[PDB]
Enzyme design. Structure first.
Site, mmCIF file in Angstrom:
data_model
loop_
_atom_site.group_PDB
_atom_site.id
_atom_site.type_symbol
_atom_site.label_atom_id
_atom_site.label_comp_id
_atom_site.label_asym_id
_atom_site.label_seq_id
_atom_site.Cartn_x
_atom_site.Cartn_y
_atom_site.Cartn_z
ATOM 1 C CB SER A 49 67.797 63.502 52.361
ATOM 2 O OG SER A 49 68.158 63.635 53.718
ATOM 3 C CD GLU A 57 67.020 72.902 63.088
ATOM 4 O OE1 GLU A 57 67.828 72.763 62.123
ATOM 5 O OE2 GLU A 57 67.397 72.967 64.287
HETATM 6 C C1 LIG Z 1 67.254 63.180 54.744
HETATM 7 O O1 LIG Z 1 66.134 62.653 54.437
HETATM 8 C C2 LIG Z 1 67.870 62.657 55.961
HETATM 9 N N1 LIG Z 1 66.804 62.292 56.928
HETATM 10 C C3 LIG Z 1 67.219 62.120 58.305
HETATM 11 O O2 LIG Z 1 68.237 62.973 58.677
HETATM 12 C C4 LIG Z 1 66.062 62.399 59.246
HETATM 13 N N2 LIG Z 1 66.580 62.871 60.483
HETATM 14 C C5 LIG Z 1 65.269 61.197 59.542
HETATM 15 C C6 LIG Z 1 65.716 59.987 59.161
HETATM 16 C C7 LIG Z 1 64.980 58.862 59.387
HETATM 17 C C8 LIG Z 1 63.785 58.939 60.055
HETATM 18 O O3 LIG Z 1 63.044 57.829 60.325
HETATM 19 C C9 LIG Z 1 63.374 60.186 60.517
HETATM 20 C C10 LIG Z 1 64.079 61.330 60.241
HETATM 21 C C11 LIG Z 1 68.752 61.447 55.572
HETATM 22 N N3 LIG Z 1 68.157 60.813 54.393
HETATM 23 C C12 LIG Z 1 67.443 59.557 54.741
HETATM 24 C C13 LIG Z 1 67.298 58.819 53.458
HETATM 25 O O4 LIG Z 1 66.530 57.901 53.381
HETATM 26 O O5 LIG Z 1 67.875 59.269 52.577
HETATM 27 C C14 LIG Z 1 68.276 58.743 55.700
HETATM 28 C C15 LIG Z 1 69.284 57.968 54.858
HETATM 29 C C16 LIG Z 1 67.540 57.816 56.616
HETATM 30 S S1 LIG Z 1 68.996 60.048 56.782
#
Ligand SMILES: *C(=O)[C@@H](NC(=O)[C@H](N)c1ccc(O)cc1)[C@@H]1N[C@@H](C(=O)O)C(C)(C)S1
Length: 265
Positions: free
Chosen positions: A42, A142
């Site tokens: 993210s 993805e």
């Molecule tokens: C971007 O990093 C996003 N990641 C999640 O959508 C992802 N599916 C994921 C989350 C947590 C895991 O253990 C595995 C995969 C969002 N950004 C993250 C962040 O820390 O910023 C979150 C807030 C957890 S979700």
């Protein structure tokens, strides 16, 4: 010795750690695996908001965007609550940065437009800031899933630090748009246990986190000393040795940041 401390942390967390802090004033750059590729996760949402701000008049923030059930495909703490009413571009930027809302980021990519659902224009925005390294190839979910070593959806601690420096400290954005991006990162809700945790309370911290599969945990920040001296801090990590379901480990980032803060104090 700093490199020794980072390597100790890698062994502690069975992780690969990357760190970059740009040189500034009288400090040498801090670098550890700084030119190795790590998944954006993210963290891309920070320059994504900058791209959207840059591309449009400020009052584009007031444009209402509508979306439906089949648009919610990832962690989306805000967009799931507002699905019945829509969200303005400004609300989407807020949610993408402050709650790392995946649907909000996907809708912002579409707003940027062009090939790859906006990923190509996002990458082009990075190239305009002199980043010839980073690439975005996919949207949520993805983009968090590429295998370890795969170059899709990656940046480097070095590349993303230089991008963030231009966005927050430099002149990539006009002051009004710069302030919007800075304030959203300042009010981030997801970062308390990462870079924030490694800096004393009297240092200001703004940030954007990322978390993914294979134990991926990232954080990119701008910090200010108690006398107003700013530094950019990029910390990226994965635990590929644990496979797809490896737990991300925030404490690694907190410890790395503590080591960085010790040098910067
Ligand atoms: C971007 O990093 C996003 N990641 C999640 O959508 C992802 N599916 C994921 C989350 C947590 C895991 O253990 C595995 C995969 C969002 N950004 C993250 C962040 O820390 O910023 C979150 C807030 C957890 S979700």
């Amino acid at each position: 010795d700093l490199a020794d401390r980072f390597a100790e942390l890698e062994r502690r967390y069975d992780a690969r750690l990357g760190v970059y802090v740009p040189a500034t004033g009288t400090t040498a750059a801090i670098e550890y695996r700084a030119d190795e590729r790590f998944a954006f996760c993210s963290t891309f949402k920070a320059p994504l908001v900058a791209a959207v701000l840059h591309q449009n008049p400020l009052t584009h923030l007031d444009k209402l965007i509508t979306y439906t059930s089949d648009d919610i495909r990832s962690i989306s703490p805000v967009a799931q609550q507002h699905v019945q009413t829509g969200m303005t571009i400004g609300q989407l930027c807020d949610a993408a940065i402050r709650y790392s809302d995946g649907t909000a980021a996907n809708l912002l990519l579409a707003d940027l437009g062009g090939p790859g659902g906006g990923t190509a224009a996002f990458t082009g925005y990075l190239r305009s800031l002199g980043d010839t390294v980073s690439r975005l190839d996919a949207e949520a979910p993805e983009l968090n899933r590429d295998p370890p070593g795969d170059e899709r959806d990656t940046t480097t601690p070095h590349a993303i630090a230089l991008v963030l420096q231009q966005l927050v400290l430099g002149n990539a954005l006009p002051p009004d748009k710069r302030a919007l991006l800075t304030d959203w990162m300042a009010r981030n809700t997801t970062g308390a246990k990462r870079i924030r945790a490694g800096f004393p309370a009297d240092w200001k911290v703004i940030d954007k986190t990322g978390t993914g599969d294979y134990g991926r945990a990232n954080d990119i920040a701008v910090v200010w000393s108690p006398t107003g001296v700013p530094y950019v801090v990029a910390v990226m990590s994965d635990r590929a040795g644990g496979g797809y379901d490896a737990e991300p480990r925030e404490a690694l980032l907190a410890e790395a940041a503590t080591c960085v803060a010790g040098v910067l104090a």
